[PDB]
Symmetry: D2
Subunit: 143 residues, 4 copies
């Protein structure tokens, strides 16, 4: 497996970025990469709560579902959750942890995903996150 | 002005795909709300005479704005017309927007006209909003 | 089928948008669409004055030179200039600006576009350029 | 001083990306962040060669000149140059090294900038680079 990490400085308070990661309405807009829509099936934001949604390629209809559970939640500071692909051919336990800290300009965002299957090329995960992070910024930075 | 807005864009996507983006609740929730806003679809009956309702929420403040109406006409990959009115009493006025699509070698031609914008809503504000929504629409409909 | 029309509302005062259309440092940054760079050869911004630029596809390096002359220059209100490619028709584009509470109203009309170049491709090119224009002029 | 580090995966070959860091017509387009234009004064792309340019805020016209020397240049793989802004209280210079590696999707880019005066908040540098990098991608990824 492989571990990946990203870092972004955002012009928004950490609490607002934090909410963006848990709010189903926010997630459906910023999480899916370009050309993908997202349907959120379950969003129980509690330690132990279940995560559930699926991405759909808009031009083909190709759907990919995934989900997991929230392992830890520290308001405006930390989110760690598991990810399990319901796709036929990707078993295992992928864990991502989001760390947020305040800055004068807003917030420092750290993301790390461990246990990424060797089948999934790391480069693809970075491309995917880069698109989603750009979308997250457009949503959280205003006002 | 007055109370009217007209938008034209060339999209690198088939007319049918763009058409689909204007009626699919999952697409709409992603591209329709402008920057800093999220969308929640309350009702979505995609057929002539059918009603629909949605609400926009400013993500930073939580401030909500709900609007709704009925579809007047639906021709696959060609046109869509619907009534659009706000629940806010401070924004009285029924809006009529008509979307027209046509094929092109690169993809599709899109024209949008919004009539009846409430007097309390500066038309320039609608242009700023649609310009953001249109950019998001392109990002969704143009790939692959 | 040789005339194109674009309209945009910008969050910047008219005077600043006007300057973006004439400042060579601004033009080199926003005019060339995605994947293109621009070199400004001439920029005599006076009525009767000439401007000359070249767009280069960054990946391939294919060059495209074009130029013309300014016919109208009213600070924050109007710019009109001719435009011709160094490849064998003359075009005239007119930019009109008006103040708005939120900033500026921008109208563009480009006439005489050679039938050789599909209008749809001009719209696509302008859409990319206008997005780049907004990013430069709306700040601060 | 402080050190900044950034990482991006780009859908373009390393040589084209490399080229974007040395071509004056490219730098003038992607290097200056939002609301800024770039004027290139001198651009001698070779070891020991001089580097000189200035960013101008388009709205105010406020100028910011900076320059340096190219210390290392390896086609499609590495670039190392010094950088210093023309400001009092800032006698020392910074060193930034760009490293590229191929990927099937295109290229992996790593940037490291050290020697940033403690007076300059690192977060501001990140925001600046994030904007420059998005412009870089739009330029180099096409075709």
């Amino acid at each position: 497996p492989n571990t990946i990490r990203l870092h972004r400085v955002l012009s928004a308070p950490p609490e607002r970025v934090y909410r963006a990661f848990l709010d189903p309405l926010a997630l459906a807009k910023w999480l899916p990469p370009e050309g993908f829509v997202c349907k959120v099936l379950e969003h129980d934001a509690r330690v132990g709560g279940a995560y559930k949604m699926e991405f759909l390629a808009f031009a083909s209809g190709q759907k990919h579902a995934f989900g997991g559970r929230y392992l830890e939640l520290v308001p405006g500071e930390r989110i760690r959750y598991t990810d399990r692909f319901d796709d036929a051919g990707l078993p295992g336990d992928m864990i991502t942890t989001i760390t947020l800290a305040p800055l004068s300009c807003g917030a420092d965002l750290s993301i790390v995903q461990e246990g990424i299957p060797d089948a999934i090329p790391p480069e693809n995960c970075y491309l995917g996150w880069q698109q989603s992070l750009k979308q997250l910024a457009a949503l959280v930075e205003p006002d």
